[PDB]
Design a binder for these strands. Structure first.
Ligand SMILES: [Mg+2]
Ligand SMILES: [Mg+2]
Length: 132
RNA sequence: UCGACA
DNA sequence: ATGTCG
C-alpha cells in the first residue's frame, strides 16, 4: 500500500537543537531531488516542516500531482495548520531558521495545492527513503 | 500519570 | 538527551 509514485522527505541533524538539513527523494528510486544547505541551528520538527513545504513548492513548480511522504506527525500537522508551533528560542543564532519557517508559513498562506501529505508508516515499512 | 511520532 | 502532539 506504499504509493511508490511519490516524493519522500526527511530531516537530518547534528544535535537537536543543532545543525539541520533536509532532503527530498523519489520514493521509487531514491534519487535525490533536492537537499537544503545545512542551517546552523534548528529543531528536528522545524526541519521536518520545512522539508514538507519545500516538497510542496517543488512539486507545484513542476506541475506534479505526486503525494509527499513524511514520517513526522508534528510536521504534517503544522503544514495542515499553516503554523509551525516551535518553542525554539529566538536569537541571532536561530534567526535564520525562524526566517525560513516564517517564509514557509507565508508560502502556505499564498498558494494552493492538492498534494496529499501522507504519513510514512515506519513501523510497517522501515525507514523512510529520504532518511539520513 | 502516560502513550506515541520523530 | 531533545522536540513535539494525542
Ligand atoms: Mg523523519
Ligand atoms: Mg530519519
Amino acid at each position: 500500500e506504499i504509493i511508490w509514485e511519490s516524493l519522500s522527505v526527511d530531516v537530518g541533524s547534528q544535535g537537536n537543537p543543532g545543525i539541520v538539513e533536509y532532503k527530498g527523494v523519489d520514493t521509487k528510486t531514491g534519487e535525490v531531488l533536492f537537499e537544503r544547505e545545512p542551517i546552523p541551528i534548528g529543531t528536528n520538527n522545524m526541519g521536518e516542516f520545512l522539508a514538507i513545504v519545500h516538497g510542496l513548492r517543488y512539486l507545484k513548480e513542476r506541475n506534479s500531482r505526486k503525494p509527499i511522504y513524511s514520517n513526522s506527525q508534528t510536521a504534517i500537522k503544522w503544514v495542515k495548520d499553516k503554523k509551525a508551533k516551535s518553542t525554539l528560542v529566538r536569537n541571532e543564532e536561530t534567526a535564520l531558521i525562524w526566517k525560513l519557517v516564517d517564509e514557509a508559513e507565508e508560502w502556505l498562506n499564498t498558494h494552493t495545492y492538492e498534494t496529499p501529505i501522507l504519513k510514512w508508516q515506519t513501523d510497517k515499512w522501515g525507514e523512510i527513503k529520504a532518511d539520513y
